[PDB]
Amino acid sequence: WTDAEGYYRVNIGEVLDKRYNVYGYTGQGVFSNVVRARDNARANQEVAVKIIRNNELMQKTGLKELEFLKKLNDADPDDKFHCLRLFRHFYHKQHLCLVFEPLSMNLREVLKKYGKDVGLHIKAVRSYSQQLFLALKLLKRCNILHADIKPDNILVNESKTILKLCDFGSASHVADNDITPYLVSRFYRAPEIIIGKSYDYGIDMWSVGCTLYELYTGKILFPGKTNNHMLKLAMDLKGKMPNKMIRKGVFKDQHFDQNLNFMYIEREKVTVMSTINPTKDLLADLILPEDQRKKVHQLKDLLDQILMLDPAKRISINQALQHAFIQE
Numbered sequence: 001w002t003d004a005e006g007y008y009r010v011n012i013g014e015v016l017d018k019r020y021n022v023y024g025y026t027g028q029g030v031f032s033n034v035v036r037a038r039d040n041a042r043a044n045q046e047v048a049v050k051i052i053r054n055n056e057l058m059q060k061t062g063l064k065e066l067e068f069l070k071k072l073n074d075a076d077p078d079d080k081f082h083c084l085r086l087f088r089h090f091y092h093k094q095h096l097c098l099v100f101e102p103l104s105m106n107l108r109e110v111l112k113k114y115g116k117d118v119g120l121h122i123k124a125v126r127s128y129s130q131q132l133f134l135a136l137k138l139l140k141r142c143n144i145l146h147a148d149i150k151p152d153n154i155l156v157n158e159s160k161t162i163l164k165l166c167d168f169g170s171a172s173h174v175a176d177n178d179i180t181p182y183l184v185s186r187f188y189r190a191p192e193i194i195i196g197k198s199y200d201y202g203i204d205m206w207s208v209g210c211t212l213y214e215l216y217t218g219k220i221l222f223p224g225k226t227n228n229h230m231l232k233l234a235m236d237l238k239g240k241m242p243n244k245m246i247r248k249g250v251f252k253d254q255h256f257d258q259n260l261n262f263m264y265i266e267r268e269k270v271t272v273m274s275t276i277n278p279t280k281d282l283l284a285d286l287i288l289p290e291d292q293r294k295k296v297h298q299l300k301d302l303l304d305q306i307l308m309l310d311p312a313k314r315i316s317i318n319q320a321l322q323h324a325f326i327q328e
């Protein structure tokens, strides 16, 4: 019934918890099997069942995902802060099963349907940003850090008008804040994580900014191969990291020398850079009608405030929701 890795495999037509009739597959995994089911106890209504991987460490993250989703759902009774709705939970053949609201597809899937480097319409990006900032508001209202905000973890409804922040498997409490430079998916990873500086809700704000650029351009903002390449790409837009920020970090020596100069790795190869000049043109890469062009400039102004290297100088959730791009 259970694989060596810890996967359940699943059978089409199988009834889970004597009510959930599995008909669809969606995708398995990675780290859990998400199946499409019909709840026979609730007039054959559509539901998504996340079957958590077995082993030891995966079940620990599953219960952690269960408690965090329960906290966010209770804090938002009217469902206005765009977070995934957990219906209930059950156990099936050793695996923990999470019953979720039915959603059409993730933002990575919609982007592929839009085309190669096409991106979503500015009106859709505007609506999506507001909902993403509302998700950050609830995340900050509670003491939770998503720590994996990317198009793959943002699900959309059938009409694609409403989005939901999903996958709380890598989520953590603010008081915990573990010293690790591999926190958050590499491309959406904040500079304070890499340097080893104290991090908070700002990492989720940075990730949102990375997604917003990708939502409009259809391209990854910083497609860095390593943690050192991620810093170089981040500095190619904002210039060299401030001296006060580098000193606060833990992994300073891995990227910066004693003279506070960046060491770019390109067979090892190390090139020392004294001052990094802002070469990346955010406006040129983002861009035709004047009503749409004005909205693009507003997105550019919002992105410059989100992409601030120092998290203390980063735009707040309230100011991002009140921004000219959202308010029109």
Ligand SMILES: Nc1ncnc2c1ncn2[C@@H]1O[C@H](COP(=O)(O)OP(=O)(O)O)[C@@H](O)[C@H]1O
Pocket (backbone or CB within 6 Å): 026, 027, 029, 030, 031, 032, 033, 034, 048, 050, 084, 100, 101, 102, 103, 104, 105, 106, 152, 153, 155, 166, 167, 168, 169
């Ligand atoms: N509530 C849902 N409704 C419909 N599909 C979902 C839902 N939740 C997740 N999925 C699908 O399953 C995919 C992976 O789910 P996820 O939470 O990331 O599992 P894991 O953390 O093991 O990778 C999502 O990208 C989405 O396609």
